[PDB]
Design a protein around this ligand. Structure first.
Ligand SMILES: CCCCNS(=O)(=O)c1ccccc1
Length: 117
């Protein structure tokens, strides 16, 4: 992807901790990236965890859209803003479910945009 290699070390520790906390496998992360998302806490709570770690969402999974936009290439920022227009605010039964709903909304609307590290 566009995702530059310097992010993967930026995220490394948070990734390990989030996967550990949530019972997440790499296989599940791979699936979300190839389009396949289910409402399983091991993956949905992983995405919430990682978003939180980078201050992209609050304690109720409200998305900080400015921070979110500022971590994207200006190439995408346009298309991202468009997708957040549609898919924000978040809604759901809990923080994990809220991010499931968001991922799903983005994936349907913009395939290029919802990547998971
Ligand atoms: C727009 C898609 C956000 C969800 N992806 S992510 O949670 O893996 C993530 C990506 C980049 C930084 C932090 C978390």
């Amino acid at each position: 992807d566009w995702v530059p290699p310097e992010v993967f070390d930026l995220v490394a520790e948070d990734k390990a901790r989030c996967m550990s906390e949530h019972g997440t496998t790499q296989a599940q992360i791979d699936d979300v990236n190839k389009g396949n998302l289910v409402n399983e806490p091991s993956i949905t709570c992983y995405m919430y965890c990682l978003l939180e770690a980078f201050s992209l969402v609050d304690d109720e999974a409200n998305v900080d859209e400015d921070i979110m936009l500022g971590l994207l290439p200006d190439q995408l920022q346009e298309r991202a803003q468009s997708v957040m227009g549609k898919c924000l605010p978040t809604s759901g039964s809990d923080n994990c479910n809220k991010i499931y709903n968001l991922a799903k909304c983005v994936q349907e609307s913009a395939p290029d945009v919802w990547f998971v590290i």
